[PDB]
Amino acid sequence: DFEEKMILIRRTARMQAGGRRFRFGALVVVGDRQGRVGLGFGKAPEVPLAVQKAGYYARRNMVEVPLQNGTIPHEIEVEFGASKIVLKPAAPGTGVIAGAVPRAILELAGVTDILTKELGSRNPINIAYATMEALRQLRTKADVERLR
Amino acid sequence: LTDPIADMLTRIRNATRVYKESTDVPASRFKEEILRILAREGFIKGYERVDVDGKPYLRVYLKYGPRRQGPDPRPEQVIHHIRRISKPGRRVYVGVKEIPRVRRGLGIAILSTSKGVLTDREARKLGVGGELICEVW
Amino acid sequence: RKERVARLLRMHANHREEVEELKAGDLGAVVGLKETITGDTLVGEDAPRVILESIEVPEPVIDVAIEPKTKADQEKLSQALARLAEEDPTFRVSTHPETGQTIISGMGELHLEIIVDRLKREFKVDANVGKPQVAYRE
Amino acid sequence: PTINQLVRKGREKVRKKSKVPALKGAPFRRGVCTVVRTVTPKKPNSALRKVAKVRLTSGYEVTAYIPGEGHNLQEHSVVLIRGGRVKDLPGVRYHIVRGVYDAAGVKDRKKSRSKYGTKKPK
Amino acid sequence: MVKIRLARFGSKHNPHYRIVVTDARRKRDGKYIEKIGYYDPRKTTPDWLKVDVERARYWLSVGAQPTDTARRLLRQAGVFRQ
Amino acid sequence: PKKVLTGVVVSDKMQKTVTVLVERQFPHPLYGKVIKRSKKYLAHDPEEKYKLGDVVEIIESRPISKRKRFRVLRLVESGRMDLVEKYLIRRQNYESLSK
Amino acid sequence: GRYIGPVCRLCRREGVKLYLKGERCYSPKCAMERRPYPPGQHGQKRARRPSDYAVRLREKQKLRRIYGISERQFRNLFEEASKKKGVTGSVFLGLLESRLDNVVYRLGFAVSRRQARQLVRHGHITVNGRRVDLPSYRVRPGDEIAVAEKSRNLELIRQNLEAMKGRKVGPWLSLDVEGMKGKFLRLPDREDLALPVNEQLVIEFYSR
RNA sequence: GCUAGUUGGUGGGGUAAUGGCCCACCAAGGCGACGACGGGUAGCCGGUCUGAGAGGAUGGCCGGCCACAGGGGCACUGAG
RNA sequence: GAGGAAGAAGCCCUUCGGGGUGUAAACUCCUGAACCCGGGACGAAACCCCCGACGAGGGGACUGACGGUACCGGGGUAAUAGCGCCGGCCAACUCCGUGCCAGCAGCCGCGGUAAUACGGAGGGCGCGAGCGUUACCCGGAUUCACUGGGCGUAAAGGGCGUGUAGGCGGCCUGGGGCGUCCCAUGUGAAAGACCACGGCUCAACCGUGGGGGAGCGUGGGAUACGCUCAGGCUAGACGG
RNA sequence: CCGAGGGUAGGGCCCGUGACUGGGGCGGUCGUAACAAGGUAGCUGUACCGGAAGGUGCGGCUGGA
Ligand code: SF4
Ligand SMILES: [Mg+2]
Ligand SMILES: [Mg+2]
Ligand SMILES: [Mg+2]
Ligand SMILES: [Mg+2]
Ligand SMILES: [Mg+2]
Ligand SMILES: [Mg+2]
Ligand SMILES: [Mg+2]
Ligand SMILES: [Mg+2]
Ligand SMILES: [Mg+2]
Ligand SMILES: [Mg+2]
Ligand SMILES: [Mg+2]
Ligand SMILES: [Mg+2]
Ligand SMILES: [Mg+2]
Ligand SMILES: [Mg+2]
Ligand SMILES: [Mg+2]
Ligand SMILES: [Mg+2]
Ligand SMILES: [Mg+2]
Ligand SMILES: [Mg+2]
Ligand SMILES: [Mg+2]
Ligand SMILES: [Mg+2]
Ligand SMILES: [Mg+2]
Ligand SMILES: [Mg+2]
Ligand SMILES: [Mg+2]
Ligand SMILES: [Mg+2]
Ligand SMILES: [Mg+2]
Ligand SMILES: [Mg+2]
Ligand SMILES: [Mg+2]
Ligand SMILES: [Mg+2]
Ligand SMILES: [Mg+2]
Ligand SMILES: [Mg+2]
Ligand SMILES: [Mg+2]
Ligand SMILES: [Mg+2]
Ligand SMILES: [Mg+2]
Ligand SMILES: [Mg+2]
Ligand SMILES: [Mg+2]
Ligand SMILES: [Mg+2]
Ligand SMILES: [Mg+2]
Ligand SMILES: [Mg+2]
Ligand SMILES: [Mg+2]
Ligand SMILES: [Mg+2]
Ligand SMILES: [Mg+2]
Ligand SMILES: [Mg+2]
Ligand SMILES: [Mg+2]
Ligand SMILES: [Mg+2]
Ligand SMILES: [Mg+2]
Ligand SMILES: [Mg+2]
Ligand SMILES: [Mg+2]
Ligand SMILES: [Mg+2]
Ligand SMILES: [Mg+2]
Ligand SMILES: [Mg+2]
Ligand SMILES: [Mg+2]
Ligand SMILES: [Mg+2]
Ligand SMILES: [Mg+2]
Ligand SMILES: [Mg+2]
Ligand SMILES: [Mg+2]
Ligand SMILES: [Mg+2]
Ligand SMILES: [Mg+2]
Ligand SMILES: [Mg+2]
Ligand SMILES: [Mg+2]
Ligand SMILES: [Mg+2]
Ligand SMILES: [Mg+2]
Ligand SMILES: [Mg+2]
Ligand SMILES: [Mg+2]
Ligand SMILES: [Mg+2]
Ligand SMILES: [Mg+2]
Ligand SMILES: [Mg+2]
Ligand SMILES: [Mg+2]
Ligand SMILES: [Mg+2]
Ligand SMILES: [Mg+2]
Ligand SMILES: [Mg+2]
Ligand SMILES: [Mg+2]
Ligand SMILES: [Mg+2]
Ligand SMILES: [Mg+2]
Ligand SMILES: [Mg+2]
Ligand SMILES: [Mg+2]
Ligand SMILES: [Mg+2]
Ligand SMILES: [Mg+2]
Ligand SMILES: [Mg+2]
């Protein structure tokens, strides 16, 4: 099976007569380190549920990510509205030179060597959703040729 | 019209994103020469020298992927990305060693030269350089 | 603090004689030093860092207050008598708890006289002096 | 901006403003103490902090902070100062370096003595 | 006049010359006209002298005079052999 | 080589000397874009034969006066008073860039 | 100079027996056996979830503490690596291992690198029959790591040479025993060596 | 907005040598939003530091050019 | 340096059972920085003297500040550790003292009787002949944005035109080849930086070789895009 | 003749300083202008007036009804 890492736990708060009433939310990345990843963000009235829920949604939503000696094929830039992830491919000696949100979503997909950067809003939650949709936008000399 | 090229790539861009089977772009020899590349490179099906109200156009035949599964059945694109590099505002000119390398191989830079309208692979082997006309992937 | 001893001089009636050494139980004047003041022990470099017996006695007998007139040049005096205090270690600057005036204190009339007269006719000082103010009470 | 506008009008380089003009560029500066008092700091705070007005060899007269528990400072104290805003105190933007000139270090200090100019206990 | 002499390099107690052609009125170790080979007076490696004898002749011809120990390592590897 | 350059005569109101305005083009070292710039050369006409409009080549020559260091080499084109206006209309325009 | 203090505590913090003590490390009397929690007042306190910086910090001190070396020298070796051709992490362990004092330990001349370093600093070792006392001598492929033959008649080389007649120096080394020599034949492969060290976590550290 | 040795010319002095370098005369020019004039600050470069790079910042030690020898002016001797 | 307890004393913690400093110490033993003796340099082979011919080659002699130093050889004592931090950023936690006081402070902010945030202690984390601090440069700053930003409401469309310079400019054919691309060649000093080897025991330092690029000069070549010049067009624009 | 510079005289720029005064920032006294239709929708350019916030005239805006 898969490996889990909680990436972001956070208490929110909502208002109601006499009291602010909370609810927690957790963003979790899940991956095999050999090629699949996934991410889901879930919110229960208690921390540990919402973590598990984040997991539930984690596996309910996964990603190809066509590794290549542990790096990615092409360099890729995606914007998830104001937040902006950039991935660059790195030679077999480097390492994962990423943030913390992109560190996880890249380590669990089994990226071993990468150059990256977080221009734009460096908000975790959108930097997350951004790193994913950029992964799931990777292609190969294959699928290019297949398409042409 | 200020940049006939940008116009065309944008005729072509705007076209595909709503999956127009074709789109026609007013014609020039230079214009054709780039299309002639798009085709040859798997980006478009190809093109023919049509005519609207007696006006010499080019009809570009667009090309996509399969219908897909899920709630967004729209195909992926064949030209995912196309944009002017050199420009009337700012000429870009690269010498051969200056020549860029689009999407780690998977894409191209079409670049005018004193030896035809080549691609990056093409000029790098031909040993020349010129005006970075655009980029496709 | 470490300190280079360049030259060593004996002072005679009429001339200054240079000499390459100064044995124990003798007096002379050493050229070179920079930080050394009076009543400060001095040892060769690789030796026991002993401090000679100090000295110590009389506390000042006469006290005189000095008013820095006006007023951005009080501190012409502030740096003046810090140069003084390592030059004469027998006067004593102090500032009054209440009233806040500056109180030079001395070994006698005469002692305060020249110290004061210097402070002006050698440091310009915009200042006058006299009887210290009294800290009263209700 | 168009590429022309940049050709014409360039891009304006950012310039920074010293937060220790008084030092005249030096690491530290020497000075004498004109006033030594306590001051009160702004909300949300509430102490009596020990300050010194100090006239520098640069020309400037600045007010400085006296770090630590207790000091030996008063009028005419010769003193050495370093860059260092104290956040709560209007107009304080340098510190007196204890253990220099007439700045006594702190009696009984045990930790971080490097920073209160106390020598090492035996 | 234009000269052939030893232009010191290396470091302290590590002499490492560079017999050289340069105008007499330069610093010893200043802009020379041409490097015509090194010299390691300490003899620390098999090559403690390699005068470009092809070049070192051209100079001597057109003027260049030399140190009384420039020639020493110029004779030593014979620019003078008849 | 003695630098040769090509430009229009904009002043002949001197005596055995003509002003030759010279354009050059080059790319902006930061912003790529090609840009024009120019320079007026006082040029030696020993036989006074050059006039307004006359696009000519002038050549790097030895000094003849303070600021004359080129002599005209060869008449290359003629009557380009459009370029002459292109430079008067700029000059003239200056009278309204004051306060 | 070197770490020099209480050394079990290194291992107890690091949650991994680093074999620093040498002769004692395999005894039930080592510390890691009796208490394998971190040193000091707070070890039996239920440990807390470690940050990524931590994780790479701990991983780094781990590698570093193993070769028992100054963070100065460590980093400078490491820098040499990055700039050197190909795979940084590997070439790191390479140069980390191509250093003398640790060789002597790999060749069991001495019990631990500490003991090894002493031996090396004392002139009791020689590379190539030239006497060499600098524990940072990067040994290069082809070198003869002698014992000083005037150091030969010495209770401690013997003892350790004696327990080294037919054990296996790794794939890159060649202990001609009896005659006290040995050889540095190959800079290691990554696979050549297992240490409790993620070669990559350390690169990701110095990337901050 | 600037400019009377100012910009050009004829003749001459000066110099190792071109030149408004200096001088007499003739002409009315020369320069400026591509930033003249003016004010500020600064010796420049090889390089150095930082930076993914582009770029930013810097110019002590060493090597190259320049400028200066308390502040000014001046010429003499000399290949200089 | 090796061995050295289910683990001394003191100190810190404690639910009072125990936990921690800690194999750390003591202790056994092995090595042997400094020191002590003995020897002891490379840097210096030319200038000059001798045969020859004052030349080519040969041969002989004098000369060492550092220096009795480096290094070698023999003997040879367990032999300085300190500084920053331990609320979050950020690696490291408890007890007392204190009580918006005394103080901390780079930003958030911490102190009002139970403070992991002040002060001391024990413990811990990081560095180690150093550790910290202030000043400043570049970085994070994609926050002057060329690479690589923006303007309906966040800072940001000129109150609206008309037009000067300027910037930009439709489709076809041809000449030039200014930009642009290519090859050659000169220049691009030395040190530096980079790759290789090599000298000092290592390294710092240093030596030898290699690889050069931008940039500019000179000659040859290309013509697609831009430029200029020359003809034609009518889809822009103006006109009837 | 030119000429360091000295001197007479009139100008331009900069910097420091000055009785007093103008507002600006930081750490009790009067009212209640704004935020809810904020108790007269708010804001607006201008204008006159008023201890003060502000009020009022004229026009505009909706970012009001
Ligand atoms: S003995 Fe056990 S505790 Fe001490 S070092 Fe060797 S491994 Fe760690
Ligand atoms: Mg969702
Ligand atoms: Mg956006
Ligand atoms: Mg943020
Ligand atoms: Mg935020
Ligand atoms: Mg795929
Ligand atoms: Mg004093
Ligand atoms: Mg309070
Ligand atoms: Mg408070
Ligand atoms: Mg005092
Ligand atoms: Mg001599
Ligand atoms: Mg003339
Ligand atoms: Mg021995
Ligand atoms: Mg780094
Ligand atoms: Mg960095
Ligand atoms: Mg005249
Ligand atoms: Mg003449
Ligand atoms: Mg003449
Ligand atoms: Mg003149
Ligand atoms: Mg003349
Ligand atoms: Mg006249
Ligand atoms: Mg110009
Ligand atoms: Mg000035
Ligand atoms: Mg200056
Ligand atoms: Mg950047
Ligand atoms: Mg220099
Ligand atoms: Mg002068
Ligand atoms: Mg002078
Ligand atoms: Mg002087
Ligand atoms: Mg003089
Ligand atoms: Mg027990
Ligand atoms: Mg105990
Ligand atoms: Mg106990
Ligand atoms: Mg021990
Ligand atoms: Mg012994
Ligand atoms: Mg010798
Ligand atoms: Mg003879
Ligand atoms: Mg001796
Ligand atoms: Mg010895
Ligand atoms: Mg001991
Ligand atoms: Mg620290
Ligand atoms: Mg840190
Ligand atoms: Mg922490
Ligand atoms: Mg208790
Ligand atoms: Mg108290
Ligand atoms: Mg503290
Ligand atoms: Mg407490
Ligand atoms: Mg509390
Ligand atoms: Mg505390
Ligand atoms: Mg803290
Ligand atoms: Mg900064
Ligand atoms: Mg930047
Ligand atoms: Mg800024
Ligand atoms: Mg931009
Ligand atoms: Mg922005
Ligand atoms: Mg607004
Ligand atoms: Mg408008
Ligand atoms: Mg207006
Ligand atoms: Mg126009
Ligand atoms: Mg055109
Ligand atoms: Mg045009
Ligand atoms: Mg050309
Ligand atoms: Mg060079
Ligand atoms: Mg070596
Ligand atoms: Mg070299
Ligand atoms: Mg035409
Ligand atoms: Mg005069
Ligand atoms: Mg005068
Ligand atoms: Mg005079
Ligand atoms: Mg004034
Ligand atoms: Mg109201
Ligand atoms: Mg109202
Ligand atoms: Mg109202
Ligand atoms: Mg309202
Ligand atoms: Mg109104
Ligand atoms: Mg009233
Ligand atoms: Mg009213
Ligand atoms: Mg109204
Ligand atoms: Mg509203």
Quickly give F10 CA vs H37 C1' distance in Å.
Answer: 23
Contact G86, A93 (CB under 8 A): yes
The protein residues having a beta carbon less than 7 Å from any atom of strand J are D 40, 42-43, 90
- Residue G94 dihedral angles phi and psi, to the nearest 5°: -45, -75
For residue B100, the domain's CATH number is 3.30.1490.10
Chosen domain end from B34, B62, B79? B79
Quickly give B17 CA vs H19 C1' distance in Å.
Answer: 71
Please give the Cα distance from F20 to F84 (Å, whole number).
11
Residue G2 lies in a domain: no
Inter-chain residue contact A145 with B42, CB threshold 8 Å: yes
The CATH architecture of the domain made up of A3-63 is: 2-Layer Sandwich (3.30)
Please give the Cα distance from F94 to F99 (Å, whole number).
11
Inter-chain residue contact F32 with B91, CB threshold 8 Å: yes
CA-closest candidate to residue F88, choices F9, F24, F18? F9
Which of A93, A95, A100 is opposite residue G207, by nearest beta carbon? A95
CA distances from G136 to C122, G73, G98, G132, G182 (A): 65, 9, 9, 10, 18
Cα angle vertex B44, ends B40, B50, to 5°? 100
Gyration radius from chain C CA atoms: 20
Quickly give B64 CA vs I9 C1' distance in Å.
Answer: 85
Domain containing G39: what range? Answer: 7-96+194-207
For residue F93, the domain's CATH number is 2.40.50.140
In this structure, the number of other CB atoms found within 10 A of the CB of residue F85 comes to 11
Please give the Cα distance from A72 to A88 (Å, whole number).
8
What's the CA-to-centroid distance between G132 and ligand 30, angstroms? 64
DSSP character at residue C121: T
Which chain B residues contact residue D4 at CB under 8 A? Answer: 89
| G111 Cβ below 6 A of ligand 1 | no
Mark whether B22 and B50 lie in a shared domain. yes
Which nucleotide is closest to D40, CA to C1'?
J27
Question: How many domains does chain B contain in total?
Answer: 2
What's the CA-to-centroid distance between B74 and ligand 75, angstroms? 59
How does B39-73 read in b/e, with b if 16+ C-beta sit within 10 Å? bebebbeebeeeeeeeeebbbbebbbeeeeeeeee
Question: How many domains does chain G contain in total?
Answer: 2
Inter-chain residue contact A148 with B76, CB threshold 8 Å: no
CA distances from G147 to A119, C5, G98 (A): 58, 51, 18
Write the residue with the smallest CA distance to atom 2 of ligand 1.
Answer: G30
Which of D33, D34, D76 is opposite residue C93, by nearest beta carbon? D76
Chains in touch with G (3+ beta-carbon pairs under 8 Å) read: A
Portions of chain A given CATH number 3.30.230.10: 64-148
Is E82 near strand I, with its CB below 7 A from some atom of it?
yes
Mark whether B38 and B68 lie in a shared domain. yes
Ligand whose nearest atom lies closest to the CA of A79: 3
Contact E3, E64 (CB under 8 A): yes
Please give the Cα distance from F69 to C123 (Å, whole number).
65
Find how far residue B103's CA is from the centre of its chain.
Answer: 15
Parallel, antiparallel or unpaired: strands B51-52 and B55-61: antiparallel
- Residue E58 dihedral angles phi and psi, to the nearest 5°: -45, -40
Please give the Cα distance from A1 to G151 (Å, whole number).
58
Parallel, antiparallel or unpaired: strands G125-127 and F68-75: unpaired
Find how far residue B90's CA is from the centre of its chain.
Answer: 19
Which CATH homologous superfamily contains domain D1-122?
Nucleic acid-binding proteins (2.40.50.140)
Domain containing B112: what range? Answer: 80-137
B1–chain A nearest CA distance, Å: 31
DSSP character at residue F93: G
* Bases of chain I with protein Cβ within 7 A: 1-7, 12-13, 19-24, 30-33, 42-47, 55-57, 72-74, 78, 80-86, 89-94, 100-112, 119-138, 142-146, 149-151, 164-173, 178-183, 189-190, 194-196, 198-203, 205-209, 214, 217-218, 221-226, 235
* A74: amino acid identity, one letter: H
C98–chain D nearest CA distance, Å: 13
Resolution of the structure in the document, Å:
2.8
Cis peptide before C71 (omega within 30 of 0): yes
The structure tokens 């190969």 sit at A140
Torsion F11-F14-F15-F16 (CA) sign: negative
Portions of chain A given CATH number 3.30.160.20: 3-63
Which chain F residues contact residue B90 at CB under 8 A? Answer: 31-33
Is G49 near strand I, with its CB below 7 A from some atom of it?
no
* Residues written for chain D: 122
The CATH architecture of the domain made up of E1-82 is: 2-Layer Sandwich (3.30)
Question: How many domains does chain F contain in total?
Answer: 1
Cis peptide before D44 (omega within 30 of 0): yes
Write the DSSP assignment of D62-105 as a string of letters. Answer: EEEE--SS-----TT-EEEEEE---TTSTTEEEEE-TTSTT---
| G172 Cβ below 6 A of ligand 1 | no
Which nucleotide is closest to F90, CA to C1'?
I165
Experimental method: X-ray
First-to-last alpha carbon distance for chain B, in angstroms, is: 26
Which chain D residues contact residue F33 at CB under 8 A? Answer: 3-4, 7
| G17 Cβ below 6 A of ligand 1 | yes
Please give the Cα distance from E51 to C122 (Å, whole number).
72
Find how far residue A25's CA is from the centre of its chain.
Answer: 16
Parallel, antiparallel or unpaired: strands B131-132 and E9-11: unpaired
Parallel, antiparallel or unpaired: strands F34-44 and F68-75: parallel
- B-chain residue closest to F31, CA distance: B90
Which nucleotide is closest to F61, CA to C1'?
H18
Please give the Cα distance from A54 to C35 (Å, whole number).
72
Annotate chain E with three-state secondary structure. Answer: CEEEECCCEEECCEEEECCEEEECCCCCCCCCCEECCCECCCCCCCCCECCCCCHHHHHHHHCCEECCCCCHHHHCCCCCCC
Mark whether G89 and G121 lie in a shared domain. no
- B-chain residue closest to A75, CA distance: B103
- Residues of F (23-62) whose Cβ lies below 8 Å from B: 27, 31-34
Chains in touch with F (3+ beta-carbon pairs under 8 Å) read: B, D
Question: G10, G14, G17: which to mutate for ligand 1, most atoms within 8 A of CB?
Answer: G17
DSSP character at residue A68: B
Region of E43 please: left (phi>0), alpha (psi -120 to 50) or beta. left
Please give the Cα distance from C22 to C9 (Å, whole number).
9
Classify domain A64-148 at the CATH class level: alpha beta
- Can you read off the two tokens belonging to residue F69? 């260091």
F33–chain B nearest CA distance, Å: 4
What's the CA-to-centroid distance between G73 and ligand 41, angstroms? 19
Chains in touch with D (3+ beta-carbon pairs under 8 Å) read: B, C, F
| G7 Cβ below 6 A of ligand 1 | yes
Query: Which uninterrupted H or E stretch holds F59?
Result: strand F56-65
